[PDB]
C-alpha cells in the first residue's frame, strides 16, 4: 500500500424563510424550510445514512431526523437561531459524522424572503474501500 486517496464531496446547506400574512396561534410570524443536499442533484444518499436537524429547545420534538432524501424540515416560528446539523455517513470508522452550526435567520417584515445557500466541501483521507465506493457513486 503506497497509493493514497483523498475524496472530496460537496454538500449544500440552505433555507427559505418568508413572512406569513396571518401569524399563527402561537404567534409564529414566519414559515421556513431548511435542508441538506448535494449539488446538481447528486445522490448524497449513497454515502449519507441520515441527517439530524437540531431545532431550538423552544420547538417541540426538537431533534428532527431524515434517513432519506429529501433531507429537510419545514416549520413555522417567530425567530431565527443557530441550528446544528449533524450529517451521518455510511462509514464503519472516522469520520462517522460531521456537525455544522447552520445560521437559520429570518428577515423582518418589509424585507424580501430569505433564500440562503451555504456550499460545504468535505475531505476524506484514505476511507475504506467500501466507503470510497459509495462516496464516488455520488
Amino acid at each position: 500500500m503506497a497509493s493514497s486517496c483523498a475524496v472530496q464531496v460537496k454538500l449544500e446547506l440552505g433555507h427559505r424563510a418568508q413572512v406569513r400574512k396571518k401569524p399563527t396561534v402561537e404567534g409564529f410570524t414566519h414559515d421556513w424550510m431548511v435542508f441538506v443536499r448535494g449539488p446538481e442533484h447528486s445522490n448524497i444518499q449513497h454515502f449519507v445514512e441520515k441527517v439530524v436537524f437540531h431545532l431550538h429547545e423552544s420547538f417541540p420534538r426538537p431533534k428532527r431526523v431524515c434517513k432519506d432524501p429529501p433531507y429537510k424540515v419545514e416549520e413555522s416560528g417567530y425567530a431565527g437561531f443557530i441550528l446544528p446539523i449533524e450529517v451521518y455517513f455510511k462509514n464503519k470508522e472516522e469520520p462517522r459524522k460531521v456537525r455544522f452550526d447552520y445560521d437559520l435567520f429570518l428577515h423582518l417584515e418589509g424585507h424580501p424572503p430569505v433564500n440562503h445557500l451555504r456550499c460545504e466541501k468535505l475531505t476524506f483521507n484514505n476511507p475504506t474501500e467500501d466507503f470510497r465506493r459509495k462516496l464516488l457513486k455520488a
Binding site: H56, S58, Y78, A79, G80, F81, F105, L106, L108
Partner: peptide
C-alpha cells in the same frame, strides 16, 4: 430576530 434571533432566539438565544
Amino acid at each position: 430576530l434571533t432566539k438565544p
